[PDB]
Write a protein that binds this DNA or RNA. Structure first.
Ligand SMILES: [Mg+2]
Ligand SMILES: [Mg+2]
Ligand SMILES: [Mg+2]
Ligand SMILES: [Mg+2]
Ligand SMILES: [Mg+2]
Ligand SMILES: [Mg+2]
Ligand SMILES: [Mg+2]
Ligand SMILES: [Mg+2]
Ligand SMILES: [Mg+2]
Ligand SMILES: [Mg+2]
Ligand SMILES: [Mg+2]
Ligand SMILES: [Mg+2]
Ligand SMILES: [Mg+2]
Ligand SMILES: [Mg+2]
Ligand SMILES: [Mg+2]
Ligand SMILES: [Mg+2]
Ligand SMILES: [Mg+2]
Ligand SMILES: [Mg+2]
Ligand SMILES: [Mg+2]
Ligand SMILES: [Mg+2]
Ligand SMILES: [Mg+2]
Ligand SMILES: [Mg+2]
Ligand SMILES: [Mg+2]
Ligand SMILES: [Mg+2]
Ligand SMILES: [Mg+2]
Ligand SMILES: [Mg+2]
Ligand SMILES: [Mg+2]
Ligand SMILES: [Mg+2]
Ligand SMILES: [Mg+2]
Ligand SMILES: [Mg+2]
Ligand SMILES: [Mg+2]
Ligand SMILES: [Mg+2]
Ligand SMILES: [Mg+2]
Ligand SMILES: [Mg+2]
Ligand SMILES: [Mg+2]
Ligand SMILES: [Mg+2]
Ligand SMILES: [Mg+2]
Ligand SMILES: [Mg+2]
Ligand SMILES: [Mg+2]
Ligand SMILES: [Mg+2]
Ligand SMILES: [Mg+2]
Ligand SMILES: [Mg+2]
Ligand SMILES: [Mg+2]
Ligand SMILES: [Mg+2]
Ligand SMILES: [Mg+2]
Ligand SMILES: [Mg+2]
Ligand SMILES: [Mg+2]
Ligand SMILES: [Mg+2]
Ligand SMILES: [Mg+2]
Ligand SMILES: [Mg+2]
Ligand SMILES: [Mg+2]
Ligand SMILES: [Mg+2]
Ligand SMILES: [Mg+2]
Ligand SMILES: [Mg+2]
Ligand SMILES: [Mg+2]
Ligand SMILES: [Mg+2]
Lengths: 134, 259, 158
RNA sequence: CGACUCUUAGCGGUGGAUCACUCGGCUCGUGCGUCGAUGAAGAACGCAGCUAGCUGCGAGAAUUAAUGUGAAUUGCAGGACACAUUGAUCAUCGACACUUCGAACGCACUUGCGGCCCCGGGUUCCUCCCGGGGCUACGCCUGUCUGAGCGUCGCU
RNA sequence: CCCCGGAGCCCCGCGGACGCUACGCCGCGACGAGUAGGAGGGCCGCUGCGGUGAGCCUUGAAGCCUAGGGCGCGGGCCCGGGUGGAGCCGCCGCAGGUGCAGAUCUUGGUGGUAGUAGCAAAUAUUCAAACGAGAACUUUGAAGGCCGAAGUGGAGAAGGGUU
RNA sequence: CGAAAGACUAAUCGAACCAUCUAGUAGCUGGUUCCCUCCGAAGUUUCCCUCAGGAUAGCUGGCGCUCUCGCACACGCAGUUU
RNA sequence: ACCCACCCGACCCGUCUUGAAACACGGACCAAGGAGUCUAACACGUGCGCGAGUCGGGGGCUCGCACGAAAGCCGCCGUGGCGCAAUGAAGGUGAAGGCCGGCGCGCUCGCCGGCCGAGGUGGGAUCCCGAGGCCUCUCCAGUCCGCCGAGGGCGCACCACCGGCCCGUCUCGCCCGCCGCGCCGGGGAGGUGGAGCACGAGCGCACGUGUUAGGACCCGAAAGAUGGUGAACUAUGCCUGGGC
RNA sequence: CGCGACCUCAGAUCAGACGUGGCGACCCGCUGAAUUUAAGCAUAUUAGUCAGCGGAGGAGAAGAAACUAACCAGGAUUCCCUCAGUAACGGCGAGUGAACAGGGAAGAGCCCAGCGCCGAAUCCCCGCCCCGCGGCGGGGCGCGGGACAUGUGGCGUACGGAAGACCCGCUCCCCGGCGCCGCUCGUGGGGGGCCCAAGUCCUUCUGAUCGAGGCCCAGCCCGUGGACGGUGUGAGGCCGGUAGCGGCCCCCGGCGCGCCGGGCCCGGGUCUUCCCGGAGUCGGGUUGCUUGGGAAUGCAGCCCAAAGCGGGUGGUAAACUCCAUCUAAGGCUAAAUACCGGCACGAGACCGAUAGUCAACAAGUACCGUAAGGGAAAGUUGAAAAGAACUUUGAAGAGAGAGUUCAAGAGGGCGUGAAACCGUUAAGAGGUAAACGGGUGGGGUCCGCGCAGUCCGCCCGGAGGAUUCAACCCGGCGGCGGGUCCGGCCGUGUCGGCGGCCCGGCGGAUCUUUCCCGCGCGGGGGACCGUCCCCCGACCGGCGACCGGCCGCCGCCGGGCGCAUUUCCA
């Protein structure tokens, strides 16, 4: 259950919260899991997805073992566009198909300074949690 | 419903003589809503017949003794495997029906422990059933934070939370009760009398202190004893084929004299 | 229009009563709010009685109540004077003091005096600094209790 | 058989019921309980690369600064930026800014007329002329200055 | 002059339905109009809540449609087929903004009337060409007409507000 | 306001319009939503500023209770008659 | 159950009405909406809990309420409500009687000891006793079991009647009492008023029906009041222009 | 005829302050109807209610008795329960209608004028320095101004106070700063930020799965986390979250210690001598309104108009009298209480687009009205725009192919797509308008058949094939029932132990203060009574309350039994 009496559990309120979320919050929502290779390495389950991560689509039509680079993150549409995840429109032109980040898995992260520090913080809180449980 | 709801308009009746129908009609304007119909429960816009008030008598009060009677009955029938089984609880493999347990069960601080216990006591097919029952509620409840529904599970009466109520918490179905503070809404859910319970020796001993035996007062609820019985031999078959009774009957006329 | 036997009864719903209906959906939240407030005051007034001050034994007026005895508002001045408690000071040790109570009978006076005597005996005056001067009780009767008194201080039983 | 009419069914229309949804309400409860001459509430007019409305803002006008965040924004453009850098974007908001009416304050409501001090062109304080800046409501309190009275006295 | 774990049974007292949801089952009689009105029973119906059906449901929920098959005195209900595309029902209790033919009812929609009444105030039009997919109506030219300077002309006020 | 018609006062006048009090009051019109089953009326009484309404009796239904004995073994009651 | 045929029957519903197929009103058609509600108070009926009690509020103690604004508990458990006692305008008063023996003159009056203790008549479901049958394969004896039972009893509830008691009130009468002897206090007999007593039945909760007060089944006035907006039409005055 | 004090009055764009409007749920002060009820209506009622005007605050108002009472007396206000639908009012009709006591929530008490004493001992504003400065403050220093004796400050206010003499005991309280220590209850106060468990595992459906089956214990894993939401269907484990006395980082609060700067020589009782109270106010008359307040509850105007062992009240006018009770005509004050406005949250047996707010949407919008004012309608393609390239007919709108999609039998007002109504296709009919009830018939539509439906089931007889047992014993297991209650556990009624009684507790208006402790009372013992528990024996209901052996019966397994038995099959 949820006990904290300032949170909500209320369809309409959590749905409003979602569809009217502001960019910086939508970053957090549009996270996706890391691969079991990276999970082992960094001690982190999931990361906010970003413009040029390498990525596998997991479920849907484009469900495959091809590792495509992310192209752009459309936070207004809650979706990401991926290198070869595309479909031909009527008139031959290609169009990047939207994939929701949660149905994607990150194989190669784009490591900047900030991202590194996020990974370091998450792994730290995990290890504190494991030490507390022990 | 709101006090104003319906009456926010200013609508006079065009009187009789204009054809139409002696309703109060919205005054003037170059809108759709003009010469329409206001106020009458029948009208669109309108105003519901006898608007619901806040001061409806929502709460309902009950005599103390009657509540205590109720809770005795409910306890009484958490024994009786028939009634428990009829209330749907899969109590086939359970070892002894007023199921009392060691008081390390106060100890437990992890669900893992709490679940293993239930599996040892063979109560786990009840939770396993609750898991199977989990499904979408039909109807408008769905859009009012009653979206999922499932079974009631085993009750667990504990004497003191030394950790237990954390351990049994995530296990779906299980309600926990303090003995000192029993509840009829939980021991007899749906107003239905059976319900499989799992007692703790510490709690189970305390019942006689709480409710009192038949020759001892409550000794905890000031002035209270158990309700008396209206008849003692409840199995009437034993009575009806006794020597004392059948000795004094007329012999049964059972020929059938048809027309 | 009345119909064949009943109470010829006069309900008072001729004023705009629905404008002034007072529902009671508060009451739970109210009770909780009161109990929270009460628990706060207890925590503030640390080893003092939560109850409040000690209050005088008092007879009820009128032939009806007459035989009963209540807590009163505060100790009369004559009562304090007899006990040997300065009226301004009594308020600082947790003794209620009204000065509107006359004192007719000697029987009521002496019993109330006895009360203040008893209170002074079983009271633990902390010193102003932790470094102890006169009056302030010993560090024994201090460590053993900086305890509150739950319920009314020295309760009255008729 | 013929046309027409009536009935029933199939398909198609018209129409938008029903059902299923729900970023909206309604009700009950909790906490706080804060507007304004330092110019409020309200009104007006403006402000976007393409923008009418809604919203957001005030000539610094879809916002500036700062702080947190850490790559977008995205209808299309265009761009920026080195996202190993105060750094995109959001959020917060403590600094800064905030057109005109409005209690509304120079007097009037035309958007009309003004007075008085200082500054720049204009002069070379020559007042004009132009532009800029700051004052110029009523009431009342404490003090201040200047005063009034065959009000009550004193000295001359 | 004996035992039913065996008389063999039309009566069996040794044990007892195929029957016995005892709110069940069974038997005999009698009776049955009904407004206003009253009462009872509805495994009649609607929506939501506590219970409960190891219920149902993308291998197709609700709703909708059906010259398909049935049940019920009836309220109604169940099955088949189609359509549809996401939820829904049985039982036991609780609760109600719970059942429509009418109210010159309310809101929305559609008929017949009906291709009907009608598009009749102030004399008037005609020929050619052009453009154009297309001309009774546009434009140009030609002719015939009217307004007839108290104008159907040329300028303003108010009002409109980009005409 | 009226050289007077009760004229005019923004298509409104023997008392304008707008909002509220207001869901104003109505012994009076109109309407009032599923099934079966059983019982089933009244339009007369007295009183009433009562006569298109109430009250009260009557007539109806519902709930019952107390007894009775077709369990070879009956008392009481009647829109009769003697 | 779709269509068609034929014979017989058969007027259009709703409504007010003594009387509607009506030359009575409402109704072109379809969809969705649409009217006996809720609160309070009383009454009677019914169900449950407890019973001379009952009661729960209001409050308090137990939790951050996930479910809880619940649930539980409280010398508060009873301040208090209702009930357990009436009757009188009120001051007030306030439900017992019998019997027996003795003492005062038994005076259908006054005082002292013992016994019983809510009276009696009729009718009363029902219990209780029961003569006597009625047989058993025989003549008698004879305990056991029934069945019926004439006849007799205790008699619930309830009804009718007669007594009794309390409070008011009248009439008539004779005695008692003491810190205060008095315009003091207390009794008796017989009538008569009381929503009285005469071995208790209430309290709480829930459901139903009825009757009210509330918008009060739904829709409906002509009106009434308070506070505001209008003389751009028109009425009349004035100012300043224009016209014949 | 000047100059100077003061007094009363002016003027300033004089120096520096304040007020003005809004909001209005709640609150205070006025003002104040009428619908309505009374079955009419005028008093009454509606109602001190709507409308009107004024003024506030986070609450307001109220509040420390000119109070209740009549008691063995209580002791500010406010709030709840109760008093009580009562006392009372009332065309005594309709109707209206409080208070005290009692129990709770909370609890807090104070200050002036006066009377007096103290060299005005007081205040404001200037100006210079040190600190402090986003709530203008402290300290110092100025012959620098003014306010003030027509009265500022200290003491002091009815609970009495002052001043004196000696009885006693002894001396911390406040603020301006500057630091520093313990992050200080939802169990780390408040705010902000960023973090933290576990499947996308195997098969298989599907357009897509969050589905279906499985996975070392209902299956794997976490579970202090299986709330909710999102994600191409239904997701504890995909993501956000959720749980947790979980973490880290900021900021802020609140309290604890140190240092400094200032202020501050601040008691109590006992005996004496003094001191003491708010006027056009009370009170009376009165008229008007108001109240339950009735020969006047409260508030008003007018007229009269006080006292000081007085004055007020003591619910029937008045006189006389005793009692009781307060001390009016000046002021402040937190708390429980209110809250349809605001900001920010949470929840619901509510509504689910003719509902719910007028308003789910560019709604107080469009639109109307000169204006006051009125005031709508209007949600849904799909998972994703993949929103139909291209060919062709047409001036085009429109089509026909082609294509996207699981589907366009989802095509931009597009989910589902009812009825009325209309087109057509098929069938059937047709001079008494249609439609209807009953009864048959004819035709259609589908539905069940049958390419014999002769439907099954027992038992039996026969003729064919078929394996293994029933019967019988033997060994084991399990179940039933039984009495000898045999042996022991189990419990009802009774009796015995007075045995638990102090190693058995509660209750009691039973007793005792021979007791103990604390102050005649409270608490605890100690007797006593009622109630609940041990010991064994006896009798009895031997009770579904159980065990152990023995018996009898049944069933299952395993042995044997080979075929006049044993089932199977046709
Ligand atoms: Mg509405
Ligand atoms: Mg539904
Ligand atoms: Mg208290
Ligand atoms: Mg009938
Ligand atoms: Mg869908
Ligand atoms: Mg509802
Ligand atoms: Mg209809
Ligand atoms: Mg024509
Ligand atoms: Mg002419
Ligand atoms: Mg022109
Ligand atoms: Mg012209
Ligand atoms: Mg005339
Ligand atoms: Mg109505
Ligand atoms: Mg009438
Ligand atoms: Mg009529
Ligand atoms: Mg008719
Ligand atoms: Mg006729
Ligand atoms: Mg008519
Ligand atoms: Mg008609
Ligand atoms: Mg309907
Ligand atoms: Mg009853
Ligand atoms: Mg009645
Ligand atoms: Mg009603
Ligand atoms: Mg009306
Ligand atoms: Mg009138
Ligand atoms: Mg103001
Ligand atoms: Mg009237
Ligand atoms: Mg009337
Ligand atoms: Mg009238
Ligand atoms: Mg009044
Ligand atoms: Mg008002
Ligand atoms: Mg105040
Ligand atoms: Mg005062
Ligand atoms: Mg009081
Ligand atoms: Mg009462
Ligand atoms: Mg009144
Ligand atoms: Mg003074
Ligand atoms: Mg989901
Ligand atoms: Mg989920
Ligand atoms: Mg996670
Ligand atoms: Mg009045
Ligand atoms: Mg008197
Ligand atoms: Mg005040
Ligand atoms: Mg809609
Ligand atoms: Mg709509
Ligand atoms: Mg709407
Ligand atoms: Mg709809
Ligand atoms: Mg619509
Ligand atoms: Mg639609
Ligand atoms: Mg729709
Ligand atoms: Mg489809
Ligand atoms: Mg579709
Ligand atoms: Mg849809
Ligand atoms: Mg559609
Ligand atoms: Mg058709
Ligand atoms: Mg044809």
């Amino acid at each position: 259950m949820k006990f904290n009496p300032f949170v909500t559990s209320d369809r309409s309120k959590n749905r409003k919260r979602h569809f009217n979320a502001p960019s910086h919050i939508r970053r957090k929502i549009m996270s996706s899991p890391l691969s079991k290779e990276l999970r082992q390495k960094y001690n982190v389950r999931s990361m906010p997805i970003r413009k040029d991560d390498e990525v596998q689509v997991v479920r849907g039509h484009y469900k495959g073992q091809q590792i495509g680079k992310v192209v752009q993150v459309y936070r207004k549409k809650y979706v990401i566009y991926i290198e070869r995840v595309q479909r031909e429109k009527a008139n031959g032109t290609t169009v990047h198909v939207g994939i929701h980040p949660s149905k994607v898995v990150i194989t190669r992260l784009k490591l900047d300074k900030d991202r590194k520090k996020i990974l370091e913080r998450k792994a730290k809180s995990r290890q504190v949690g494991k030490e507390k449980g022990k | 419903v709101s006090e104003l709801a319906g009456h926010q308009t200013s609508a006079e009746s065009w009187g009789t003589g204009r054809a139409v129908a002696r309703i109060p009609r919205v005054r003037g304007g170059g809108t759709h809503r003009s010469g329409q119909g206001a106020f009458g429960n029948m009208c669109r816009g309108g105003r519901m017949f006898a608007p619901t008030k806040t001061w409806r008598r929502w709460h309902r009060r009950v005599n103390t003794t009657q509540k205590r009677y109720a809770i005795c009955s409910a306890l009484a029938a958490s024994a009786l495997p028939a009634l428990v089984m009829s209330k749907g609880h899969r109590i086939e493999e359970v070892p002894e029906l007023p199921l009392v347990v060691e008081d390390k069960v106060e100890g437990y601080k992890k669900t893992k422990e709490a679940v293993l216990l239930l599996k040892k006591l063979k109560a786990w097919n009840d939770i396993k059933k609750v898991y199977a029952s989990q499904r979408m509620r039909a109807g408008k409840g769905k859009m009012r934070n009653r979206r999922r529904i499932q079974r009631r599970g085993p009750c667990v009466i504990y004497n003191e939370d030394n950790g237990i109520v954390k351990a049994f918490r995530n296990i779906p179905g299980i309600t926990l009760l303090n003995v000192t503070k029993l509840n009829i809404l939980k021991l007899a859910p749906g107003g239905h009398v059976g319900r499989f319970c799992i007692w703790t020796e510490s709690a189970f001993r305390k019942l006689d202190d709480l409710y009192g035996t038949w020759r001892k007062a409550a000794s905890l609820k000031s002035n209270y004893n158990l309700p008396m019985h209206k008849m003692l031999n409840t199995d009437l078959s034993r009575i009806l084929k006794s020597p004392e009774i059948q000795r004094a009957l007329r012999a049964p006329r059972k020929k059938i004299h048809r027309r | 229009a009345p119909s064949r036997n009943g109470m010829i009864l006069k309900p008072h719903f001729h004023k705009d009563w629905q404008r002034r209906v007072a529902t009671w959906f508060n009451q739970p939240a109210r009770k909780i709010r009161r109990r929270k407030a009460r628990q706060a005051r207890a925590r503030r007034i640390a080893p003092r009685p939560a109850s409040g001050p000690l209050r005088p034994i008092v007879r009820c007026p009128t032939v009806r109540y007459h035989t009963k005895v209540r807590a009163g508002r505060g100790f009369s001045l004559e009562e304090l004077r007899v006990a040997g408690i300065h009226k301004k000071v009594a308020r600082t040790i947790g003794i209620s003091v009204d000065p509107r109570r006359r004192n007719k009978s000697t029987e009521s006076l002496q019993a109330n005096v006895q009360r203040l005597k008893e209170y002074r005996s079983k009271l633990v005056l902390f010193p102003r600094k932790p470094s102890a001067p006169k009056k302030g009780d010993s560090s024994a009767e201090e460590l053993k209790l900086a305890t509150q008194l739950t319920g009314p201080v020295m309760p009255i039983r008729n």
